[PDB]
mmCIF file of C-alpha atoms and ligand atoms in Angstrom:
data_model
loop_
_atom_site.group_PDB
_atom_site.id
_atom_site.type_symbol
_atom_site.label_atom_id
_atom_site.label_comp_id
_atom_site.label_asym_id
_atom_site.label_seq_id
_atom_site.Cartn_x
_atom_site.Cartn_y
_atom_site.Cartn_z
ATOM 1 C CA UNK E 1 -4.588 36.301 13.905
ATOM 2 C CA UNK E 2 -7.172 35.142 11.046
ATOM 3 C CA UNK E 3 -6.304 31.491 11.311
ATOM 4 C CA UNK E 4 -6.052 31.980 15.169
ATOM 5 C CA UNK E 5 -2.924 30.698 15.437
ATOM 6 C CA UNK E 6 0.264 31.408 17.973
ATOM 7 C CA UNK E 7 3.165 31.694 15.261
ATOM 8 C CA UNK E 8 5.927 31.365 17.751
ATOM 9 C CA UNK E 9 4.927 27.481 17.420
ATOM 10 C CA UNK E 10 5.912 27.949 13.962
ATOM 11 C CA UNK E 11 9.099 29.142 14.983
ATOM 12 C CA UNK E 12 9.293 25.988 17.359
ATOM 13 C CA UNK E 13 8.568 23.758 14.838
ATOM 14 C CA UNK E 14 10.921 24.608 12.168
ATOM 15 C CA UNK E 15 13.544 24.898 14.776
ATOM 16 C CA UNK E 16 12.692 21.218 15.838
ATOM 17 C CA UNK E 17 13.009 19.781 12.192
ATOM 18 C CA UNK E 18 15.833 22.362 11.396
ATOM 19 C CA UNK E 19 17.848 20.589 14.999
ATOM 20 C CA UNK E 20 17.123 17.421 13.622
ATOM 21 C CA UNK E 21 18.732 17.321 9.982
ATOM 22 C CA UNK E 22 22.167 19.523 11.318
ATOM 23 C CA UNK E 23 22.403 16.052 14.005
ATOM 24 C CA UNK E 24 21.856 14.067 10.914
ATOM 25 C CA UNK E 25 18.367 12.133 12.246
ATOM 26 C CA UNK E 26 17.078 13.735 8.840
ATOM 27 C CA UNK E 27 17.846 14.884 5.706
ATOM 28 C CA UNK E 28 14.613 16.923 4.994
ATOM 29 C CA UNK E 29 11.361 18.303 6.143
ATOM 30 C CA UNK E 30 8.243 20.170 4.906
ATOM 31 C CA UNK E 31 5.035 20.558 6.431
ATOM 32 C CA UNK E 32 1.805 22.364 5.601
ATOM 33 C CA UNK E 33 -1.351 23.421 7.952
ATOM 34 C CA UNK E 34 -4.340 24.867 7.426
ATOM 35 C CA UNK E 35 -7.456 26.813 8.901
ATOM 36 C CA UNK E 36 -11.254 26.422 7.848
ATOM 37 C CA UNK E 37 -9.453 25.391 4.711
ATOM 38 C CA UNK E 38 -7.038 27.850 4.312
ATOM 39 C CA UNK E 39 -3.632 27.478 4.348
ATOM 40 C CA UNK E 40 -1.455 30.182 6.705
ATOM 41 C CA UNK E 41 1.641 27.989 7.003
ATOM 42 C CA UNK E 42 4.005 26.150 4.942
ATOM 43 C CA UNK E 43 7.386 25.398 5.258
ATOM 44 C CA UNK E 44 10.059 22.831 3.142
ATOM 45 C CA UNK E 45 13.194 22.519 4.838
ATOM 46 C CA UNK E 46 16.913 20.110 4.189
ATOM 47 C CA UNK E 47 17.772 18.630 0.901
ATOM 48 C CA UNK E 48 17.820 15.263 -0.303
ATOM 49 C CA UNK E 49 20.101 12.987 -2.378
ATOM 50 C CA UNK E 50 19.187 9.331 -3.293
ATOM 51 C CA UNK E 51 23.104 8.619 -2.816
ATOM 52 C CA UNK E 52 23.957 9.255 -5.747
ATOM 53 C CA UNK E 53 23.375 12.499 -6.946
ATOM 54 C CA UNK E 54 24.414 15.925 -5.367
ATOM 55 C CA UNK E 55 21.629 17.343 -2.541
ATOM 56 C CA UNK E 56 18.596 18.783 -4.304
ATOM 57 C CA UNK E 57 16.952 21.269 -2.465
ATOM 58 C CA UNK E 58 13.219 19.873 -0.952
ATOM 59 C CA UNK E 59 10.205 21.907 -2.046
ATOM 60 C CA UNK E 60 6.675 22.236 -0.776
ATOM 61 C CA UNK E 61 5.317 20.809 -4.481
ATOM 62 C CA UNK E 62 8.138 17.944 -4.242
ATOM 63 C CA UNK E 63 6.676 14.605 -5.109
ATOM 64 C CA UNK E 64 7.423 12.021 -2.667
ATOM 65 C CA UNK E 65 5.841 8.340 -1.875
ATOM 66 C CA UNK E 66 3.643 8.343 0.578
ATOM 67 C CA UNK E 67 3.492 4.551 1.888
ATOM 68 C CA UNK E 68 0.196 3.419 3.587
ATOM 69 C CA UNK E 69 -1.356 6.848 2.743
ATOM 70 C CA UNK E 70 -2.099 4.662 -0.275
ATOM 71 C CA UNK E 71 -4.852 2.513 1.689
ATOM 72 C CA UNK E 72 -6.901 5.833 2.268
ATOM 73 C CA UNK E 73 -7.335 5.845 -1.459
ATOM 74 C CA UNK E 74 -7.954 2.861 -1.231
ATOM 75 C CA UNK E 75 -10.807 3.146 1.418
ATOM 76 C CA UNK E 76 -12.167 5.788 -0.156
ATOM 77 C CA UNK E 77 -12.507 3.822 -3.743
ATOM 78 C CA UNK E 78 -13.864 0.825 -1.962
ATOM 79 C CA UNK E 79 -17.102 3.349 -0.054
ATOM 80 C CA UNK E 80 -17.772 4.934 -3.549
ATOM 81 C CA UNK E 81 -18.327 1.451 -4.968
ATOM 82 C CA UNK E 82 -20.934 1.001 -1.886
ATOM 83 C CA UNK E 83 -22.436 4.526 -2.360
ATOM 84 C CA UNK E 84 -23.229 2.596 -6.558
ATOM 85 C CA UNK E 85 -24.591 -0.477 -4.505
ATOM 86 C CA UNK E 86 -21.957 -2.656 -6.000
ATOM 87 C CA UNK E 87 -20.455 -3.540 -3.077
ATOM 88 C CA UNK E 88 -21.549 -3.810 0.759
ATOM 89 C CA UNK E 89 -19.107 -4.213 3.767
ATOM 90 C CA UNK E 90 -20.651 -7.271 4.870
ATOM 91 C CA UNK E 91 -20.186 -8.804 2.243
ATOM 92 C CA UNK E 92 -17.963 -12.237 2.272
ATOM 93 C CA UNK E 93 -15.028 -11.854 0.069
ATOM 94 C CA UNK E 94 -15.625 -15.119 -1.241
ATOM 95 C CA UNK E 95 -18.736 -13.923 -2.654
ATOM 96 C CA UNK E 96 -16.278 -11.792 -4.820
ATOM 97 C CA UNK E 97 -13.317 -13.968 -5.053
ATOM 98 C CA UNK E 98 -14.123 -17.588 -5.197
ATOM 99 C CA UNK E 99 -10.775 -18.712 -3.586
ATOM 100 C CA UNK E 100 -12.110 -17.783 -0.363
ATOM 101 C CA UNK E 101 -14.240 -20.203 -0.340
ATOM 102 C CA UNK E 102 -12.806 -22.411 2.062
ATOM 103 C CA UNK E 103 -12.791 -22.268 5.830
ATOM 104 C CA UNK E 104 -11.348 -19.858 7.799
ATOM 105 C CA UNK E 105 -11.519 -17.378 4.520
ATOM 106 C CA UNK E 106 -15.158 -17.829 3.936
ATOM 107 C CA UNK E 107 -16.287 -15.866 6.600
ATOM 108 C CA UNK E 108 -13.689 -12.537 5.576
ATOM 109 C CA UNK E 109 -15.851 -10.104 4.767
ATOM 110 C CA UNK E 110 -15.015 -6.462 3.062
ATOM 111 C CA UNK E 111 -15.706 -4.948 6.662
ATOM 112 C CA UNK E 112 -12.924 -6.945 8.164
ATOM 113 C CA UNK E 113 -10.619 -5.712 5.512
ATOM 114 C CA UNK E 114 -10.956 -2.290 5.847
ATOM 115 C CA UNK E 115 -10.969 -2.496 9.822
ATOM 116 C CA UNK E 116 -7.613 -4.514 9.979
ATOM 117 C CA UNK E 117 -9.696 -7.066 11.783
ATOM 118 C CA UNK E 118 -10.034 -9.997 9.301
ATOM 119 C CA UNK E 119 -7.288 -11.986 10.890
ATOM 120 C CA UNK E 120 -4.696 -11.138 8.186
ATOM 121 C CA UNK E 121 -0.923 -11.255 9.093
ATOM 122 C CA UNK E 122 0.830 -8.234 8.693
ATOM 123 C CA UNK E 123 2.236 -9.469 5.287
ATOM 124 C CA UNK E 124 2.736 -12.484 3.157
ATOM 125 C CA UNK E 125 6.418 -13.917 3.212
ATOM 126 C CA UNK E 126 7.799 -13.808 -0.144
ATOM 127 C CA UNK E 127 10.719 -16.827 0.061
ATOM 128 C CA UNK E 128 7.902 -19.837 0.136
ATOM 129 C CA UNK E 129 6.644 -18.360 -2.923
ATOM 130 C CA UNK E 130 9.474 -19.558 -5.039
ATOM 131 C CA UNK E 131 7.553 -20.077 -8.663
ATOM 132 C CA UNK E 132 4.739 -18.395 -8.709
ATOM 133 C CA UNK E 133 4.388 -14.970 -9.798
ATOM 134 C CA UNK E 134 3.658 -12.685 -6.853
ATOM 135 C CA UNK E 135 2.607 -9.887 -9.093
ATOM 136 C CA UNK E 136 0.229 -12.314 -10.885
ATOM 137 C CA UNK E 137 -3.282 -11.298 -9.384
ATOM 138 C CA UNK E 138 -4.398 -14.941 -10.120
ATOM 139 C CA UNK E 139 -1.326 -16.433 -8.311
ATOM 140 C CA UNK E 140 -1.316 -14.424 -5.645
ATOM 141 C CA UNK E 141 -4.694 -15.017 -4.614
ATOM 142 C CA UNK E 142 -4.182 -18.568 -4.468
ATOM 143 C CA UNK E 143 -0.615 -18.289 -2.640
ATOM 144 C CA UNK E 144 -2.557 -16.251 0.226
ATOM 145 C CA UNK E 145 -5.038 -18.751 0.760
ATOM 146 C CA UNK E 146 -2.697 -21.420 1.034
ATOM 147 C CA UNK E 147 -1.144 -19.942 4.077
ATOM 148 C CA UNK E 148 -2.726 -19.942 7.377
ATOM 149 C CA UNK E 149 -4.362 -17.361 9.127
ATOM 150 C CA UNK E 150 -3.203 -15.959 11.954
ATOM 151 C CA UNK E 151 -6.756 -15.370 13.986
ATOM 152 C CA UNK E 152 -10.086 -15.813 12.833
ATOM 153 C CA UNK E 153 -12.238 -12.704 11.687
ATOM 154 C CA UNK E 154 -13.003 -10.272 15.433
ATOM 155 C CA UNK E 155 -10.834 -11.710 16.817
ATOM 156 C CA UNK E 156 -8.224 -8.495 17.425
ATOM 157 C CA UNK E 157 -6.514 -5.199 15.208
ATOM 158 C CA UNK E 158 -4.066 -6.564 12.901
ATOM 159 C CA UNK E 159 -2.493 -3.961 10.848
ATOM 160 C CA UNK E 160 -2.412 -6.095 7.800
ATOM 161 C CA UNK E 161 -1.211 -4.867 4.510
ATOM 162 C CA UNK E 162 -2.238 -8.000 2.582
ATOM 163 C CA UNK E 163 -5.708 -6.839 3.353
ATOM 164 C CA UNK E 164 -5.684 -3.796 1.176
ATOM 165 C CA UNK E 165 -3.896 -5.805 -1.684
ATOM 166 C CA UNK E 166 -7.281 -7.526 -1.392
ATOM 167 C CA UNK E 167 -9.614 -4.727 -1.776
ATOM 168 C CA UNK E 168 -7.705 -3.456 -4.667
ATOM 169 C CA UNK E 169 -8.430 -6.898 -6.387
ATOM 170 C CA UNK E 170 -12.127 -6.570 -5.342
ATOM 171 C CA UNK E 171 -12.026 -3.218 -6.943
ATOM 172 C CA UNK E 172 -10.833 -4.133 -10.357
ATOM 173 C CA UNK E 173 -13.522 -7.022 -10.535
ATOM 174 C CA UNK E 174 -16.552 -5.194 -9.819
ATOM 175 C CA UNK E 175 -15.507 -2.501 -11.899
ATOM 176 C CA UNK E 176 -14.201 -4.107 -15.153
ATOM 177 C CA UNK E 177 -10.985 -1.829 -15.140
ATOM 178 C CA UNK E 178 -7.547 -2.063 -12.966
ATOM 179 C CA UNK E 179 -7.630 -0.773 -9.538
ATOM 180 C CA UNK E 180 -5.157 1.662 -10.810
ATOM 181 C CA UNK E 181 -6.905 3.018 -13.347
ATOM 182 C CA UNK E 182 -9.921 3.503 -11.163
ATOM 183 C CA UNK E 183 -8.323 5.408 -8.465
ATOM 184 C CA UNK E 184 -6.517 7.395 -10.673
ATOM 185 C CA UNK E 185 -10.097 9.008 -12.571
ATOM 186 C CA UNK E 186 -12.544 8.904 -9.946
ATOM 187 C CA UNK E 187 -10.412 10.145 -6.858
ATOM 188 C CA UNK E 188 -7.267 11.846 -8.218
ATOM 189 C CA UNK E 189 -8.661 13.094 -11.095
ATOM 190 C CA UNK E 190 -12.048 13.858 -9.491
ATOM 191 C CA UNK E 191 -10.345 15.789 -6.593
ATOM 192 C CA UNK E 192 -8.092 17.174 -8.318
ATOM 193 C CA UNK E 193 -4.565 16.411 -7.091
ATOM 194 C CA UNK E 194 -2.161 17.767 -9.331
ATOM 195 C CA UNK E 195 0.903 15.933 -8.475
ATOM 196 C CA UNK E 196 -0.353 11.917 -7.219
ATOM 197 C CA UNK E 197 0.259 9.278 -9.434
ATOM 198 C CA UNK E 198 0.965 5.301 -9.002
ATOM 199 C CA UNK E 199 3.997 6.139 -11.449
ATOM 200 C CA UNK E 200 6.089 9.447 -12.320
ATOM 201 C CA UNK E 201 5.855 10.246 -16.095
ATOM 202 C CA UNK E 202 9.866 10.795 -17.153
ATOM 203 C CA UNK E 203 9.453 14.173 -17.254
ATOM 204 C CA UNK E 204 8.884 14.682 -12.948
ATOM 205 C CA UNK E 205 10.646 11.804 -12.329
ATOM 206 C CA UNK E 206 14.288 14.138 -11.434
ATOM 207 C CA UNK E 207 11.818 16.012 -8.889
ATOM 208 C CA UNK E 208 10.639 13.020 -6.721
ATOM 209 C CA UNK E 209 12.659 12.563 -3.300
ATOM 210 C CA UNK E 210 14.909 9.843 -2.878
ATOM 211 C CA UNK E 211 16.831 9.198 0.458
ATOM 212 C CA UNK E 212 17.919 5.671 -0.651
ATOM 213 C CA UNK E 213 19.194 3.748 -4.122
ATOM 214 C CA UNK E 214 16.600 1.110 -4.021
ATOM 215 C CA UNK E 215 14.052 3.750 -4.135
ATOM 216 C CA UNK E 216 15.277 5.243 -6.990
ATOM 217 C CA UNK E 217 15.334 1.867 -8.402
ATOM 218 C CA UNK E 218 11.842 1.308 -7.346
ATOM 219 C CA UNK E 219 11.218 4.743 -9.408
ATOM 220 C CA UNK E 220 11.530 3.456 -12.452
ATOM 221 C CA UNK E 221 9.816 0.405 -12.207
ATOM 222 C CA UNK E 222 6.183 -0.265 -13.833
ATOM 223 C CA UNK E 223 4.443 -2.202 -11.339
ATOM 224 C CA UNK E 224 5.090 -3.287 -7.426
ATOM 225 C CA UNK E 225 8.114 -5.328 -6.628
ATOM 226 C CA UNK E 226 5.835 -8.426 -4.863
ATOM 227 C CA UNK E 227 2.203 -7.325 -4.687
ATOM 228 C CA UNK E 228 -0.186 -7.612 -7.958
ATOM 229 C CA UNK E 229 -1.705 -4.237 -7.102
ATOM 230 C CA UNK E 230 -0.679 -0.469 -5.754
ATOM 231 C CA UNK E 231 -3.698 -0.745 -2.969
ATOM 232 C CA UNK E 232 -1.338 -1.056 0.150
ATOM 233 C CA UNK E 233 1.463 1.368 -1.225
ATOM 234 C CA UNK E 234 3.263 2.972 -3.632
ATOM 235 C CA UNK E 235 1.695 5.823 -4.464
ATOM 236 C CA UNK E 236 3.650 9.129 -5.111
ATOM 237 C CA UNK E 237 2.005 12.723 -3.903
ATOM 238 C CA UNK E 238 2.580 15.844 -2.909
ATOM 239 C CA UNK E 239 1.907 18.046 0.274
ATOM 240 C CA UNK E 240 -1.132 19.934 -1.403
ATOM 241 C CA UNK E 241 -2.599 16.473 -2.350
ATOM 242 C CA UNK E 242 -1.988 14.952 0.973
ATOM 243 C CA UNK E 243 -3.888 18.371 2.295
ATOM 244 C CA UNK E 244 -6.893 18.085 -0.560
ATOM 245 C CA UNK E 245 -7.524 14.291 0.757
ATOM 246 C CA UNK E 246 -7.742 15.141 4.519
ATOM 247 C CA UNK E 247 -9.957 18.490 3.759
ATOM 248 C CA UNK E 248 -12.380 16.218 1.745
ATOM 249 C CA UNK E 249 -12.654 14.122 4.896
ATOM 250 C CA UNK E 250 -13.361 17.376 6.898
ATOM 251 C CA UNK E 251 -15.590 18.347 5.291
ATOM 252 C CA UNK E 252 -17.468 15.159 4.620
ATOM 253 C CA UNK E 253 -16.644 14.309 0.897
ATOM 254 C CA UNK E 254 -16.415 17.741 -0.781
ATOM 255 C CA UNK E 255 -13.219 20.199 -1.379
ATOM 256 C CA UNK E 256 -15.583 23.138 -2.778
ATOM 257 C CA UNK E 257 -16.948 21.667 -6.468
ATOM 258 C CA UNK E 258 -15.247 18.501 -5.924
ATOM 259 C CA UNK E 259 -17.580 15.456 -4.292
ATOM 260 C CA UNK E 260 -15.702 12.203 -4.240
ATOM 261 C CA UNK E 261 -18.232 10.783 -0.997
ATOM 262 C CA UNK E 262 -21.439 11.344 0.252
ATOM 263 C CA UNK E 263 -22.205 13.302 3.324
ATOM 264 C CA UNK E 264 -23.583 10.398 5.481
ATOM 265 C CA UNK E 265 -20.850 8.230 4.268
ATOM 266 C CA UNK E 266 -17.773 10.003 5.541
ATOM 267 C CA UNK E 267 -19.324 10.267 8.545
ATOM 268 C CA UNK E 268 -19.721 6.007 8.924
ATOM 269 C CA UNK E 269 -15.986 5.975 7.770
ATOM 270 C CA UNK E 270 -14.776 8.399 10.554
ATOM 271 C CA UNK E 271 -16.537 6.518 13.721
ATOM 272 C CA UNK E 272 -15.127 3.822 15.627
ATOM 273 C CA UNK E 273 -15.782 0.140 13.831
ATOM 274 C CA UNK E 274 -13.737 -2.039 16.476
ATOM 275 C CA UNK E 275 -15.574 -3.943 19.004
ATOM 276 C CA UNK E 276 -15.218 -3.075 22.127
ATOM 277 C CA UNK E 277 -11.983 -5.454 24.125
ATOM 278 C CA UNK E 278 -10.014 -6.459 21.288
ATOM 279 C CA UNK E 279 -6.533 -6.287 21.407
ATOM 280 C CA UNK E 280 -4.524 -4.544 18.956
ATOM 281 C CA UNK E 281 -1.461 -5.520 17.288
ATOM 282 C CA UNK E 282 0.964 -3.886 14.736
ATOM 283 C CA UNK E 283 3.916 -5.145 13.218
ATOM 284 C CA UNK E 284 3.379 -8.738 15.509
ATOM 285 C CA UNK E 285 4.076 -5.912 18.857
ATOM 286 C CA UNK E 286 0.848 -5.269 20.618
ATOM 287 C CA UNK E 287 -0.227 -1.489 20.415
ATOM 288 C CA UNK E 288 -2.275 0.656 22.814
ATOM 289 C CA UNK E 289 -5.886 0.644 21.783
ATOM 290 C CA UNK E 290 -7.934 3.043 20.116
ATOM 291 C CA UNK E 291 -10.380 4.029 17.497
ATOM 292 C CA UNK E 292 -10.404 3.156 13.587
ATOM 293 C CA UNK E 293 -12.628 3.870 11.481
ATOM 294 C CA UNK E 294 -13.514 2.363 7.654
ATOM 295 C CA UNK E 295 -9.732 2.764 6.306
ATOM 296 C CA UNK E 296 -8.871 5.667 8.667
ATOM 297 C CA UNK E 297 -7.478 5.792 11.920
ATOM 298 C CA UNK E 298 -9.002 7.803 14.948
ATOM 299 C CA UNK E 299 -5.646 7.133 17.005
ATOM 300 C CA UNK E 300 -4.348 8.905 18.408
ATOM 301 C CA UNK E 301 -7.169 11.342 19.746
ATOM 302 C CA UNK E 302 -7.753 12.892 23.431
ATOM 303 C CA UNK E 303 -5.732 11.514 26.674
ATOM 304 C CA UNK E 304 -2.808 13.083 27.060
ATOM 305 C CA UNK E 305 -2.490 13.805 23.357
ATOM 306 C CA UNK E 306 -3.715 17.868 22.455
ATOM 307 C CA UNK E 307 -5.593 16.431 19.304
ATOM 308 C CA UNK E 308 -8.855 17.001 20.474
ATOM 309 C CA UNK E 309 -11.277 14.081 20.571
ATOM 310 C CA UNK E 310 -12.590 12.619 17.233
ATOM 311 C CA UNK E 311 -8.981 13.866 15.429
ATOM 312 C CA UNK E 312 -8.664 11.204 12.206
ATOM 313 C CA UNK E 313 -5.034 10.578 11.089
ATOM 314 C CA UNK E 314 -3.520 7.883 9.070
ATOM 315 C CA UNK E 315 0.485 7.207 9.251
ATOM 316 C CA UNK E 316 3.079 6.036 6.216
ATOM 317 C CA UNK E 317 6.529 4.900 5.973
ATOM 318 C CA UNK E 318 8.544 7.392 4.881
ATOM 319 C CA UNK E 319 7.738 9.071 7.070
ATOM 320 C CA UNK E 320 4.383 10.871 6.168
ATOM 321 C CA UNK E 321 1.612 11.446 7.846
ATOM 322 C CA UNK E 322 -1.928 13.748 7.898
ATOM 323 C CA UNK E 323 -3.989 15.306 10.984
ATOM 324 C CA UNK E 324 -6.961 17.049 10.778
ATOM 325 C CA UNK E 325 -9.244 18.260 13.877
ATOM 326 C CA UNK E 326 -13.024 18.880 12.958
ATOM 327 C CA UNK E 327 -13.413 20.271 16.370
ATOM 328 C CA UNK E 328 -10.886 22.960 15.261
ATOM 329 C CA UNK E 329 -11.343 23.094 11.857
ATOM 330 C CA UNK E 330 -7.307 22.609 11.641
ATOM 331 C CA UNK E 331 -5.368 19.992 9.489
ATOM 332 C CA UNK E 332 -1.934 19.464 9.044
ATOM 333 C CA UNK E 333 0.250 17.094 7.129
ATOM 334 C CA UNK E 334 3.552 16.816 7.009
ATOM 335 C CA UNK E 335 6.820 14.771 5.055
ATOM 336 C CA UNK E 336 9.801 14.033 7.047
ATOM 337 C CA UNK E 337 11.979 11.865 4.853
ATOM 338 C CA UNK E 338 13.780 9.115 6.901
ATOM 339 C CA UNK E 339 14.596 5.120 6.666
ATOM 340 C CA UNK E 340 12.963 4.030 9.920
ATOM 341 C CA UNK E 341 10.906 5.600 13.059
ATOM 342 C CA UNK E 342 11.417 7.251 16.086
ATOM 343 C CA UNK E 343 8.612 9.180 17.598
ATOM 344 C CA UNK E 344 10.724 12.107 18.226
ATOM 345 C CA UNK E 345 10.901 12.947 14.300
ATOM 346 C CA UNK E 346 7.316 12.247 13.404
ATOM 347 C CA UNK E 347 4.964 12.207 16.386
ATOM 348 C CA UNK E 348 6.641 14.840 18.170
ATOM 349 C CA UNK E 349 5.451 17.758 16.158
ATOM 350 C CA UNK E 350 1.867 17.188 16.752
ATOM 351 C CA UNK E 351 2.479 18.326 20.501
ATOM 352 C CA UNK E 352 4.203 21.714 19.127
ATOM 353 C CA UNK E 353 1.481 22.170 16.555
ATOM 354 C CA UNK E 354 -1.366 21.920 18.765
ATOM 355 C CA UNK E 355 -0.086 23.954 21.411
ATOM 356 C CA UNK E 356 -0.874 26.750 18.870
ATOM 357 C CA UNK E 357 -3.922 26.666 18.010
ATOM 358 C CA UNK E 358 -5.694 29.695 19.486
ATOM 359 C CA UNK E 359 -9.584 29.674 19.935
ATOM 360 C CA UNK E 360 -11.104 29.814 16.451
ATOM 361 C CA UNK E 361 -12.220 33.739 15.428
HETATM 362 C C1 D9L Y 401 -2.263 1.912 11.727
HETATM 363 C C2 D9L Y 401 -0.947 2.352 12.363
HETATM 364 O O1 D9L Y 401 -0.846 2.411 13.543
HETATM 365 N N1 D9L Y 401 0.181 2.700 11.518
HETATM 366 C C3 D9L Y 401 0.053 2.622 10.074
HETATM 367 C C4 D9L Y 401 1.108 3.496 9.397
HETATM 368 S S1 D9L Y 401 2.724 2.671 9.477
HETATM 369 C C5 D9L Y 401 3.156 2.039 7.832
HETATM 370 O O2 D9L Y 401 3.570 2.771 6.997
HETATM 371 C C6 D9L Y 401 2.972 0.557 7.523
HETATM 372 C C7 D9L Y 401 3.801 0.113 6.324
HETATM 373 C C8 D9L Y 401 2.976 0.158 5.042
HETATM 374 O O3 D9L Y 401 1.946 -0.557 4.932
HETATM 375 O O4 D9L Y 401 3.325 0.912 4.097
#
């Protein structure tokens, strides 16, 4: 075995997905895993239909949104602009956007952003905004700090997505152009991902998965339905792109000719920023604690899980996800189509893929 890998785990996991969409859990699958940066399996499995159309037939190169994947673009934007010294993580956000400048706001700073610890709810409601533009980056802004906080900055995890909308505003004003336009030449282009962009051209718009109408509906559409920016979500990929972002990360900002980050700075965004005793919370639930790093999560990892220690992930709604071990040089990433969670149908696999992995040779 070159990649040192026990391929009757492969059979296990396409029989797992395979079980799955004949019970009707899902309607497609595809994976993709990899070796000192090779590829030696890659499966696409199930078709899909938006509800509408007849079942297409879901590839490995089929373009699908990847959620909160987004904010690891998004993270990774944000630590080039520090690597140019036009940003730092400590600094205030007010420093950047004025409104902030009141208490409570005044002391976020661009650290507590990317950590999910700058006391940020999970989201801003959207039916108290009645006549104001939420897509309006000048209305928003002042609609957010209108609203309360829920804690104070350190104070515990919040997975916030209102925090990334933020950084993609503090993006486009250091920078002089949008955040989309930013992310789309110096880390897609620069990486070279094929198949990611913030919005379909016509022409690959019949080969995106859709499992729902108002994601077809969302397909069409040239900006986000209530957020002023694409920094928390909504950006469209493929498994190979999902695959090129987590090898960069492996191997510490370079995929070959590409550099998108500096050596020493992947290695600050992969180690644990949380203080030590603070609680974590996710979707107002609490949630068992555990590493994250600068945009990127180091949970799960170790304990009973077979990731080995130091294993960086980040999750999307989808479902998506990518894994990558720099103990074992292994990486895997994965799209499983389907309208909520369950554990069994995302998290699940990571126990049979593991369980493969044979001592590296
Ligand atoms: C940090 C953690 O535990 N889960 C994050 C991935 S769940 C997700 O997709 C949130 C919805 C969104 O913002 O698109």
């Amino acid at each position: 075995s070159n990649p040192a890998f026990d391929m009757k785990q492969i059979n296990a996991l396409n029989g797992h997905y395979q079980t799955m969409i004949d019970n009707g859990d899902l309607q497609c699958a595809s994976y993709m895993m990899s070796r000192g940066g090779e590829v030696f399996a890659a499966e696409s499995l199930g078709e899909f239909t938006g509800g509408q159309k007849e079942k297409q037939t879901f590839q490995l190169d089929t373009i699908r949104e990847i959620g909160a994947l987004t904010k690891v673009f998004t993270a990774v934007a944000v630590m080039q602009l520090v690597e140019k010294g036009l940003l730092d993580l400590k600094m205030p956000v007010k420093l950047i956007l004025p409104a902030f400048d009141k208490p409570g706001f005044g002391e976020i700073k661009i650290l507590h952003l990317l950590t999910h610890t700058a006391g940020l709810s999970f989201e801003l409601d959207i039916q108290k905004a009645e006549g104001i533009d939420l897509t309006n980056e000048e209305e928003w802004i002042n609609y957010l700090v209108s609203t309360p906080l829920e804690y104070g900055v350190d104070e515990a995890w919040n997975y916030s997505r209102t925090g990334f909308v933020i950084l993609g505003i503090i993006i486009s004003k250091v920078t002089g152009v949008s955040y989309e336009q930013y992310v789309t030449k110096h880390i897609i282009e620069a990486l070279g991902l094929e198949r990611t962009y913030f919005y379909v051209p016509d022409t690959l718009k019949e080969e995106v998965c859709v499992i729902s109408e108002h994601e077809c509906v969302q397909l069409e559409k040239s900006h986000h339905p209530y957020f002023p920016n694409k920094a928390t979500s909504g950006l469209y990929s493929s498994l190979r792109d999902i695959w090129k972002l987590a090898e960069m990360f492996r191997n510490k900002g370079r995929l070959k000719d590409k550099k998108l980050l500096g050596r020493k700075t992947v290695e600050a965004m992969l180690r644990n920023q949380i203080k030590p005793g603070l609680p974590f919370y996710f979707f107002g639930a609490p949630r068992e604690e555990g590493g994250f790093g600068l945009g990127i999560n180091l949970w799960p990892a170790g304990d009973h899980y077979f990731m080995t220690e130091g294993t960086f992930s980040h999750l999307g709604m989808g479902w998506c996800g990518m894994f990558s071990d720099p103990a074992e040089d292994f990486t895997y990433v994965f799209f499983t189509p389907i309208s909520e969670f369950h554990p069994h149908a995302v998290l699940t696999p990571l126990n049979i893929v593991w369980a493969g992995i044979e001592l590296e040779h």
